[PDB]
């Protein structure tokens, strides 16, 4: 198995003892994803990508974080929705920090954090920084971390056109949209019900945020753009593009 | 469709809670060494498995489990010096339980059952519960009720303890990665258990105190505290039904319709 | 008749807030390197200047700004390895924003506009707001409204973008110490600028991921991410009026009497 | 070009630290009520002004000041019940001081002077310094030196006290918004002072203890603890030279050039 | 020169003992908690301190000022934190206290600490304080600081002694709050703070295999005790005291041998 | 007994039940006090005064805080002396806050915090503020706290004249001096060995603080003044003044009803 959770400590110890062990940590969230998808999408997707990348480069995947930072309106609908279960920033940062500290104790020195929830970013970054600060106090400076969001690897203009033949608008309105739905169709068809999609126009917000969040500024279904044009085929395209891009990036950052 | 909150859309979840009788379950585990014969997510798999079967019988829902738990103690987990074991600081675990309870309250939920499969998590789960309730109280909510239990506590009946432990019983004290857990795994996840690797050693014994930093020489090299050589899928099935039934009834009594 | 709270008497401030409908504005910047050609308090100066002008037009008051912001990230500020750059830990920035909101609420204020001038601050400002609003609810206050915004998010009109970037626009991705900020500075604080020191280097290109510890070699030696050789006072005047008007109308719509 | 780090480019700042004996100064103030006659940023303006002058005179640099400080105490600042006064929790002020020292240490700086302008700040500035120095030790750094001082502690000359308080000096325990601060403000920021609005009331008196919640009746209505009627620009310039001079020498003593 | 209590020593006396190189320090960790109608509320501080004092005299150790406030009371372990008098700290507060103290003893040059807990619920937070402190010490280059944490009652294991304490059969520390065990030790150590006449004789408390929150006052005896101390005696107390003192004294010699 | 720890919860409940019960809490420290005194002086003195004041006005005394904030050179010698065991500020604040929260839960509403360690003050104050903030969130606003350092009641020139016949240099250098040593001779003479006093010249400091602490600026013995002229008689004088003033103040702030 490529999952650390499915290994005995002896199998894990042996892999780390090899000296060139690369670990991957998916970081997601429990969040509403419209009427058509389940709420663990942000955990499922990064974990899936990690698995496939891990199989191709010989890496191991740590148990993913199921709860992430609070959902923001302009990018995820808003934390006012039912089901969405968010952690405070300090809690997420502390979790990332504790994990990096423990991996360092194991002898691991190469970590890839794969974010599946846009809003986690800064808290993952702070957690990495606080952990490296600590490792430095303990005499460790060779621990390296690569943090990335798999969607950032779908930049090829060609690829974007096959995914958005009617023109692209940006990652800003993608919550529960074509991109994530297509991936879910390919990896978890049982958890996607395209027939429930609400084909509302893309969501537009002014250049600023309001708190407490105003429900009426987010489309009723919770999506920021219609996933009507999503397909298992598009999902397969995105997946391979992400897996190959991420696998090559890892080889480049963590060379033997 | 599913009993798992993560496998539902927010609308389905919303509907289940709006019914006003919704009971939610949260498994709290750990990524910890379990000897040479079992994978390291045992403490997550078991409570989650027990939650699913209880949820199916009483109509409850199961929240995504907490994969990381408190540090492993030598006298009940072998120690935190083992590789693979990835523990959280107490504050981090406490804060996670606290944030989740707060969010569930925001959804309108008021009935929560925390089920941990990692002995050392207990006190931090309790503090997180206490801190969340205090906070809910400041918010004007005093009807949020929480039940916290470790599934193995429901295996009390002597008749069941003879079946599992013929040659005698040395309490849950020494039991990490032993008969009990290994049996359940054999029944629930036979592919994640290789009993052929079990290192059969005599029951670990410690003095009536703890030492820090942990001295590696005071815990069997395998990481186990007792041999799981007599574990069996049959013992597993027994343990499983006993727990599912007991916990299911306990919940019905604490959260009557 | 200043718009700055710090320049007022507590009785003058009190009358303003007790008058009702009082809008407070808090600039949130940072002490960060901005190349060879600009001073390091740019992120405090710019948003403060915008606040002053907006407050003068709509009748709002401006709180003293937060001088220190969150750590600088390579893909938008060059990195926190540069000298001079003095960054706070996330929890520190978040707690500062939280404390201030709590106090304004005690004053009786209920309308706050947070104007960010440092890209990396956003999420910590957001958490501060959320933690504060949560707290106000415990106190029985649910009518406190906050609007957070970065003054640059108001420069989107194609026509305006055309005049600022004739030879093309590569986004705000690498707009640190570039044409945008440098232009604004030339128009508001020309003495703290010196285009002759600008290093006319090509745009910065980074892979679709981040690496820690930060690799100093992946950031232009000067600290800038894009050349500001084409900055000017004229462009500064354009951006300024655009932002002031856009933000002023925005505030009127979010905070009507 | 300036003594304010905020007004320098990172290159110039780096060149100054490279010298090896650069001194940095950090003003720590507060946004707090100061009666009917003065603005509320007095505690930032004054220590900032003194830092500027001291820094220019001795060749040091001034960091951006902390605009928000610890909660106002009744017996020393009227109380945190007044509107306008915007205070931070102790942990927040402490953490801010701690983070700054950590960063300055990263630049290579090793000499810092913290000039407090708000009486109640001190202990939290101290914990911040302690926690920072503890971290530096873990990181292998033990040559970072910090001097913390409240500028008013340099006005102790009996002859100076006389010129400032003919009728007598009843201590700094009721000098909130009184003759001392108002005088300095008249010498530095006269536009932010209006003696016409001063409420000439007798010196507030307090028992040897504090009560919480703070009882509004135990503090003069206007917010001041003593009258600033006798304040003057001359006294202010007197205080200014005494402080700048005194602090300037203490710094040269504690941070001798190399 | 003066006593086994660090608080009664001058810093020079303390310094002289630590300079020895193998000085053992003991820290009592108790609580201010209700103990039924028959005993005072500082029992959890008194008992461990009393055990520490005696152990210190026999092995040559010093005793630090005890922590008076401990972690919140649990219904199934101490009646519950809803009774008046009981004054508990949050987990983070007790952990931080233990952490700060260890950090300081290390600065003194001490390297051997025994934490004697007298309140069942303190255990895990003491443990986290130890772990966090040892982590800090490590960043500071210190890896030779050793900590032994124990609850004195765990040294009362011999079946023989157990029969003499419970001639009618044991019941486990699951309901030994204010029961026979603590009351006997008090009758032997502080008779003036105990009055058996007020002891409410009721059947042992029993609880399901789980806890509920908010706590339900009804699931715990009214007096606060989980079992009766009616059969408590100054004699049983003298027996328990000696067993613990000797057991712990020998355990400490084992863990901290003289250099 | 006036000690809460020596009461039964029933007896304590009965006292708070009166509705006007005043609780007193000593806050001290474990700190070096020269060659002539033990290190728990800062706990013994305020606890002793508390005891007397409580017996006199009918109040109860809570267990004292044995550990306090870090010793400062200019008022405690420095935190570099062995024996001195100090808490971080956050830990002391949190301890005060938790106790006040618990007392509020008991129904109690009157608390006097008696400090006996100079450095604790502001952290005791933050703890009080934070706890009252919480009580407010919980709908409780009738909880009143009086905080004081017992030595602040010894102001009368006549009384000082008698204690320092040959002049007085303020509390600025009283650590382990005449004042505390005199009280100890009158209250705990067995804990004082006046024969060990190191009669050195008073300590002098500039108008500022230096960090890290330089041991060279503190008399080797750890005292800031010589206690050679301390006496049981002066101890009884000081004790009279304190108990008197404090008792009167509390009856003033917490009148019976
Ligand atoms: Cl998303
Ligand atoms: Cl286990
Ligand atoms: Cl920027
Ligand atoms: Cl002041
Ligand atoms: Cl107990
Ligand atoms: Cl003192
Ligand atoms: Mn998301
Ligand atoms: Mn476990
Ligand atoms: Mn910036
Ligand atoms: Mn002030
Ligand atoms: Mn107890
Ligand atoms: Mn002291
Ligand atoms: Zn998503
Ligand atoms: Zn397990
Ligand atoms: Zn900038
Ligand atoms: Zn002032
Ligand atoms: Zn007890
Ligand atoms: Zn003292």
CSV table of N, CA and C in Angstrom, one decimal, chain A residues 27-141:
chain,number,residue,atom,x,y,z
A,27,UNK,N,-4.7,17.7,2.7
A,27,UNK,CA,-5.4,18.5,3.6
A,27,UNK,C,-6.7,19.0,3.0
A,28,UNK,N,-7.8,18.5,3.5
A,28,UNK,CA,-9.1,18.9,3.0
A,28,UNK,C,-10.0,19.7,3.8
A,29,UNK,N,-11.3,19.3,3.8
A,29,UNK,CA,-12.4,19.9,4.6
A,29,UNK,C,-13.7,19.2,4.4
A,30,UNK,N,-14.6,19.4,5.3
A,30,UNK,CA,-15.9,18.9,5.3
A,30,UNK,C,-16.7,20.1,4.9
A,31,UNK,N,-17.1,20.2,3.6
A,31,UNK,CA,-17.8,21.4,3.2
A,31,UNK,C,-18.9,21.1,2.1
A,32,UNK,N,-20.0,21.9,2.2
A,32,UNK,CA,-21.1,21.8,1.3
A,32,UNK,C,-20.6,22.0,-0.1
A,33,UNK,N,-21.0,21.2,-1.0
A,33,UNK,CA,-20.6,21.3,-2.4
A,33,UNK,C,-21.8,21.2,-3.4
A,34,UNK,N,-22.8,22.1,-3.1
A,34,UNK,CA,-24.0,22.2,-3.9
A,34,UNK,C,-25.0,21.0,-3.6
A,35,UNK,N,-25.9,20.9,-4.5
A,35,UNK,CA,-26.9,19.8,-4.4
A,35,UNK,C,-26.4,18.5,-5.0
A,36,UNK,N,-25.4,18.6,-5.9
A,36,UNK,CA,-24.9,17.5,-6.6
A,36,UNK,C,-23.8,16.7,-6.0
A,37,UNK,N,-23.0,17.2,-5.1
A,37,UNK,CA,-21.9,16.4,-4.5
A,37,UNK,C,-21.9,16.3,-3.0
A,38,UNK,N,-21.2,15.2,-2.6
A,38,UNK,CA,-21.1,15.0,-1.1
A,38,UNK,C,-20.2,16.1,-0.5
A,39,UNK,N,-20.1,16.1,0.8
A,39,UNK,CA,-19.3,17.1,1.5
A,39,UNK,C,-17.8,16.8,1.7
A,40,UNK,N,-17.4,15.6,1.5
A,40,UNK,CA,-15.9,15.3,1.7
A,40,UNK,C,-15.1,15.4,0.4
A,41,UNK,N,-15.6,16.1,-0.6
A,41,UNK,CA,-14.9,16.3,-1.9
A,41,UNK,C,-13.5,16.8,-1.7
A,42,UNK,N,-13.3,17.8,-0.8
A,42,UNK,CA,-11.9,18.3,-0.6
A,42,UNK,C,-10.9,17.4,0.1
A,43,UNK,N,-11.4,16.3,0.7
A,43,UNK,CA,-10.5,15.3,1.3
A,43,UNK,C,-10.3,14.3,0.2
A,44,UNK,N,-11.4,13.8,-0.5
A,44,UNK,CA,-11.3,12.8,-1.5
A,44,UNK,C,-10.4,13.1,-2.7
A,45,UNK,N,-10.5,14.3,-3.3
A,45,UNK,CA,-9.7,14.7,-4.4
A,45,UNK,C,-8.2,14.7,-4.1
A,46,UNK,N,-7.8,15.5,-3.2
A,46,UNK,CA,-6.3,15.5,-2.9
A,46,UNK,C,-5.8,14.1,-2.6
A,47,UNK,N,-6.5,13.3,-1.8
A,47,UNK,CA,-6.1,12.0,-1.4
A,47,UNK,C,-5.9,11.1,-2.7
A,48,UNK,N,-6.8,11.2,-3.6
A,48,UNK,CA,-6.8,10.4,-4.8
A,48,UNK,C,-5.6,10.8,-5.7
A,49,UNK,N,-5.3,12.1,-5.8
A,49,UNK,CA,-4.2,12.5,-6.6
A,49,UNK,C,-2.9,12.1,-5.9
A,50,UNK,N,-2.8,12.1,-4.6
A,50,UNK,CA,-1.7,11.7,-3.8
A,50,UNK,C,-1.4,10.2,-4.1
A,51,UNK,N,-2.4,9.4,-4.0
A,51,UNK,CA,-2.3,8.0,-4.2
A,51,UNK,C,-1.7,7.7,-5.6
A,52,UNK,N,-2.2,8.3,-6.6
A,52,UNK,CA,-1.6,8.0,-8.0
A,52,UNK,C,-0.2,8.5,-8.2
A,53,UNK,N,0.1,9.7,-7.6
A,53,UNK,CA,1.4,10.3,-7.7
A,53,UNK,C,2.3,9.4,-6.9
A,54,UNK,N,1.9,8.9,-5.7
A,54,UNK,CA,2.7,8.1,-4.8
A,54,UNK,C,3.0,6.8,-5.5
A,55,UNK,N,2.1,6.2,-6.2
A,55,UNK,CA,2.3,4.9,-6.9
A,55,UNK,C,3.3,5.1,-8.0
A,56,UNK,N,3.4,6.3,-8.6
A,56,UNK,CA,4.3,6.5,-9.7
A,56,UNK,C,5.7,6.9,-9.2
A,57,UNK,N,5.9,7.5,-8.0
A,57,UNK,CA,7.2,7.9,-7.6
A,57,UNK,C,7.7,7.2,-6.4
A,58,UNK,N,6.9,6.3,-5.8
A,58,UNK,CA,7.4,5.5,-4.7
A,58,UNK,C,7.3,6.3,-3.4
A,59,UNK,N,6.3,7.2,-3.3
A,59,UNK,CA,6.1,7.9,-2.1
A,59,UNK,C,5.0,7.3,-1.2
A,60,UNK,N,4.8,7.8,0.0
A,60,UNK,CA,3.8,7.3,0.9
A,60,UNK,C,2.8,8.5,1.3
A,61,UNK,N,1.6,8.1,1.5
A,61,UNK,CA,0.6,9.1,1.8
A,61,UNK,C,0.0,9.0,3.2
A,62,UNK,N,0.2,10.1,4.0
A,62,UNK,CA,-0.3,10.2,5.3
A,62,UNK,C,-1.8,10.3,5.4
A,63,UNK,N,-2.4,10.0,6.5
A,63,UNK,CA,-3.9,10.2,6.6
A,63,UNK,C,-4.2,11.6,6.4
A,64,UNK,N,-5.2,11.9,5.6
A,64,UNK,CA,-5.6,13.3,5.3
A,64,UNK,C,-6.3,14.0,6.4
A,65,UNK,N,-6.2,15.3,6.5
A,65,UNK,CA,-6.9,16.1,7.5
A,65,UNK,C,-8.3,16.3,6.9
A,66,UNK,N,-9.3,15.8,7.7
A,66,UNK,CA,-10.7,15.9,7.3
A,66,UNK,C,-11.4,17.2,7.5
A,67,UNK,N,-10.9,18.0,8.4
A,67,UNK,CA,-11.5,19.3,8.7
A,67,UNK,C,-10.5,20.4,8.4
A,68,UNK,N,-10.9,21.4,7.7
A,68,UNK,CA,-10.1,22.6,7.3
A,68,UNK,C,-10.6,23.9,7.8
A,69,UNK,N,-10.0,25.0,7.3
A,69,UNK,CA,-10.4,26.3,7.7
A,69,UNK,C,-11.8,26.7,7.2
A,70,UNK,N,-12.4,27.7,7.9
A,70,UNK,CA,-13.7,28.3,7.6
A,70,UNK,C,-13.9,28.6,6.1
A,71,UNK,N,-15.1,28.2,5.6
A,71,UNK,CA,-15.5,28.5,4.2
A,71,UNK,C,-15.7,30.0,4.0
A,72,UNK,N,-15.1,30.5,3.0
A,72,UNK,CA,-15.3,31.9,2.6
A,72,UNK,C,-16.3,32.1,1.5
A,73,UNK,N,-17.2,33.1,1.6
A,73,UNK,CA,-18.2,33.3,0.6
A,73,UNK,C,-17.7,33.5,-0.9
A,74,UNK,N,-16.9,34.5,-1.1
A,74,UNK,CA,-16.3,34.7,-2.5
A,74,UNK,C,-15.6,33.6,-3.1
A,75,UNK,N,-15.3,32.5,-2.3
A,75,UNK,CA,-14.6,31.4,-2.9
A,75,UNK,C,-15.1,30.0,-2.5
A,76,UNK,N,-16.1,29.9,-1.6
A,76,UNK,CA,-16.6,28.6,-1.1
A,76,UNK,C,-18.1,28.6,-0.7
A,77,UNK,N,-18.7,29.8,-0.9
A,77,UNK,CA,-20.1,29.9,-0.5
A,77,UNK,C,-20.4,30.6,0.8
A,78,UNK,N,-19.7,30.1,1.9
A,78,UNK,CA,-19.9,30.8,3.2
A,78,UNK,C,-20.0,29.7,4.3
A,79,UNK,N,-19.5,30.0,5.4
A,79,UNK,CA,-19.6,29.1,6.6
A,79,UNK,C,-21.0,29.0,7.2
A,80,UNK,N,-22.0,29.6,6.6
A,80,UNK,CA,-23.3,29.7,7.2
A,80,UNK,C,-24.1,28.4,6.7
A,81,UNK,N,-23.6,27.7,5.8
A,81,UNK,CA,-24.3,26.5,5.3
A,81,UNK,C,-24.2,25.3,6.3
A,82,UNK,N,-25.2,24.4,6.3
A,82,UNK,CA,-25.3,23.3,7.2
A,82,UNK,C,-24.3,22.3,6.7
A,83,UNK,N,-23.8,21.3,7.5
A,83,UNK,CA,-22.8,20.4,7.0
A,83,UNK,C,-21.4,20.8,7.1
A,84,UNK,N,-21.1,22.0,6.6
A,84,UNK,CA,-19.8,22.5,6.6
A,84,UNK,C,-19.4,22.6,8.1
A,85,UNK,N,-18.3,21.9,8.4
A,85,UNK,CA,-17.7,21.8,9.7
A,85,UNK,C,-16.3,22.3,9.7
A,86,UNK,N,-16.1,23.5,10.1
A,86,UNK,CA,-14.8,24.2,10.0
A,86,UNK,C,-14.0,24.3,11.4
A,87,UNK,N,-12.7,24.3,11.3
A,87,UNK,CA,-11.8,24.5,12.4
A,87,UNK,C,-11.4,25.9,12.5
A,88,UNK,N,-10.9,26.4,13.6
A,88,UNK,CA,-10.4,27.8,13.8
A,88,UNK,C,-9.0,27.7,13.1
A,89,UNK,N,-8.5,28.8,12.7
A,89,UNK,CA,-7.1,28.9,12.1
A,89,UNK,C,-6.0,28.3,13.0
A,90,UNK,N,-6.1,28.6,14.3
A,90,UNK,CA,-5.1,28.1,15.2
A,90,UNK,C,-5.1,26.6,15.3
A,91,UNK,N,-6.2,26.0,15.2
A,91,UNK,CA,-6.4,24.6,15.3
A,91,UNK,C,-5.7,23.9,14.1
A,92,UNK,N,-6.0,24.4,12.9
A,92,UNK,CA,-5.5,23.8,11.7
A,92,UNK,C,-4.0,24.0,11.6
A,93,UNK,N,-3.5,25.2,12.0
A,93,UNK,CA,-2.1,25.5,12.0
A,93,UNK,C,-1.4,24.5,13.0
A,94,UNK,N,-1.9,24.4,14.2
A,94,UNK,CA,-1.4,23.5,15.2
A,94,UNK,C,-1.3,22.0,14.8
A,95,UNK,N,-2.3,21.6,14.0
A,95,UNK,CA,-2.3,20.2,13.5
A,95,UNK,C,-1.2,20.0,12.5
A,96,UNK,N,-1.0,20.9,11.6
A,96,UNK,CA,0.0,20.8,10.6
A,96,UNK,C,1.4,20.8,11.3
A,97,UNK,N,1.5,21.7,12.2
A,97,UNK,CA,2.8,21.8,13.0
A,97,UNK,C,3.1,20.6,13.8
A,98,UNK,N,2.1,20.0,14.5
A,98,UNK,CA,2.4,18.8,15.2
A,98,UNK,C,2.8,17.6,14.3
A,99,UNK,N,2.2,17.5,13.2
A,99,UNK,CA,2.5,16.4,12.2
A,99,UNK,C,3.9,16.6,11.7
A,100,UNK,N,4.3,17.8,11.3
A,100,UNK,CA,5.6,18.0,10.8
A,100,UNK,C,6.7,17.7,11.8
A,101,UNK,N,6.4,18.0,13.1
A,101,UNK,CA,7.3,17.8,14.2
A,101,UNK,C,7.5,16.3,14.4
A,102,UNK,N,6.4,15.5,14.3
A,102,UNK,CA,6.5,14.1,14.5
A,102,UNK,C,7.2,13.4,13.4
A,103,UNK,N,7.0,13.8,12.1
A,103,UNK,CA,7.6,13.2,11.0
A,103,UNK,C,9.1,13.5,11.1
A,104,UNK,N,9.5,14.6,11.6
A,104,UNK,CA,10.9,14.9,11.8
A,104,UNK,C,11.5,13.9,12.8
A,105,UNK,N,10.8,13.6,13.8
A,105,UNK,CA,11.3,12.7,14.8
A,105,UNK,C,11.5,11.3,14.3
A,106,UNK,N,10.7,10.9,13.3
A,106,UNK,CA,10.8,9.6,12.6
A,106,UNK,C,12.0,9.5,11.8
A,107,UNK,N,12.5,10.7,11.3
A,107,UNK,CA,13.7,10.7,10.5
A,107,UNK,C,13.3,11.2,9.1
A,108,UNK,N,12.0,11.4,8.9
A,108,UNK,CA,11.6,11.8,7.6
A,108,UNK,C,12.1,13.3,7.4
A,109,UNK,N,12.3,13.7,6.1
A,109,UNK,CA,12.8,15.0,5.8
A,109,UNK,C,12.3,15.6,4.6
A,110,UNK,N,11.3,14.9,3.9
A,110,UNK,CA,10.7,15.3,2.7
A,110,UNK,C,9.2,15.2,2.8
A,111,UNK,N,8.5,16.3,2.7
A,111,UNK,CA,7.1,16.3,2.8
A,111,UNK,C,6.4,17.2,1.8
A,112,UNK,N,5.3,16.6,1.2
A,112,UNK,CA,4.5,17.3,0.2
A,112,UNK,C,3.1,17.5,0.8
A,113,UNK,N,2.6,18.7,1.0
A,113,UNK,CA,1.3,18.9,1.5
A,113,UNK,C,0.4,19.2,0.3
A,114,UNK,N,-0.7,18.5,0.2
A,114,UNK,CA,-1.5,18.7,-0.9
A,114,UNK,C,-2.9,19.3,-0.5
A,115,UNK,N,-3.1,20.5,-0.7
A,115,UNK,CA,-4.3,21.2,-0.3
A,115,UNK,C,-5.5,21.0,-1.3
A,116,UNK,N,-6.6,20.6,-0.7
A,116,UNK,CA,-7.8,20.4,-1.6
A,116,UNK,C,-8.9,21.4,-1.3
A,117,UNK,N,-8.6,22.3,-0.3
A,117,UNK,CA,-9.5,23.3,0.2
A,117,UNK,C,-8.8,24.7,0.1
A,118,UNK,N,-9.1,25.5,-0.9
A,118,UNK,CA,-8.5,26.8,-1.1
A,118,UNK,C,-8.2,27.7,0.1
A,119,UNK,N,-9.2,27.7,1.1
A,119,UNK,CA,-9.1,28.5,2.3
A,119,UNK,C,-8.0,28.0,3.3
A,120,UNK,N,-7.5,26.8,3.2
A,120,UNK,CA,-6.5,26.3,4.1
A,120,UNK,C,-5.1,26.9,4.0
A,121,UNK,N,-4.8,27.2,2.7
A,121,UNK,CA,-3.5,27.7,2.4
A,121,UNK,C,-2.6,28.5,3.4
A,122,UNK,N,-3.1,29.6,3.9
A,122,UNK,CA,-2.3,30.4,4.8
A,122,UNK,C,-2.1,29.7,6.2
A,123,UNK,N,-3.0,28.9,6.6
A,123,UNK,CA,-2.8,28.2,7.8
A,123,UNK,C,-1.9,27.1,7.7
A,124,UNK,N,-1.8,26.5,6.5
A,124,UNK,CA,-0.9,25.4,6.3
A,124,UNK,C,0.5,26.0,6.3
A,125,UNK,N,0.6,27.1,5.6
A,125,UNK,CA,1.9,27.9,5.5
A,125,UNK,C,2.4,28.3,6.9
A,126,UNK,N,1.5,28.8,7.8
A,126,UNK,CA,1.9,29.2,9.1
A,126,UNK,C,2.4,28.0,9.9
A,127,UNK,N,1.6,26.9,9.7
A,127,UNK,CA,2.0,25.6,10.4
A,127,UNK,C,3.3,25.1,10.0
A,128,UNK,N,3.6,25.2,8.7
A,128,UNK,CA,4.9,24.8,8.2
A,128,UNK,C,6.0,25.7,8.9
A,129,UNK,N,5.8,27.0,8.8
A,129,UNK,CA,6.8,27.9,9.4
A,129,UNK,C,7.1,27.7,10.9
A,130,UNK,N,6.0,27.6,11.6
A,130,UNK,CA,6.2,27.3,13.1
A,130,UNK,C,7.0,26.0,13.3
A,131,UNK,N,6.7,25.0,12.5
A,131,UNK,CA,7.3,23.7,12.7
A,131,UNK,C,8.8,23.8,12.3
A,132,UNK,N,9.1,24.5,11.2
A,132,UNK,CA,10.5,24.6,10.8
A,132,UNK,C,11.3,25.4,11.8
A,133,UNK,N,10.7,26.4,12.4
A,133,UNK,CA,11.3,27.2,13.4
A,133,UNK,C,11.7,26.3,14.6
A,134,UNK,N,10.8,25.4,15.0
A,134,UNK,CA,11.1,24.5,16.1
A,134,UNK,C,12.2,23.5,15.7
A,135,UNK,N,12.1,23.0,14.5
A,135,UNK,CA,13.2,22.0,14.1
A,135,UNK,C,14.5,22.7,14.1
A,136,UNK,N,14.6,24.0,13.8
A,136,UNK,CA,15.8,24.7,13.8
A,136,UNK,C,16.3,24.8,15.2
A,137,UNK,N,15.4,25.0,16.2
A,137,UNK,CA,15.9,25.0,17.6
A,137,UNK,C,16.4,23.7,18.0
A,138,UNK,N,16.0,22.6,17.4
A,138,UNK,CA,16.4,21.3,17.7
A,138,UNK,C,17.6,20.8,16.8
A,139,UNK,N,18.2,21.8,16.1
A,139,UNK,CA,19.3,21.4,15.2
A,139,UNK,C,19.0,20.8,13.9
A,140,UNK,N,17.8,20.8,13.4
A,140,UNK,CA,17.4,20.2,12.1
A,140,UNK,C,17.1,21.3,11.1
A,141,UNK,N,17.9,21.3,10.0
A,141,UNK,CA,17.7,22.3,8.9
A,141,UNK,C,17.5,21.7,7.6
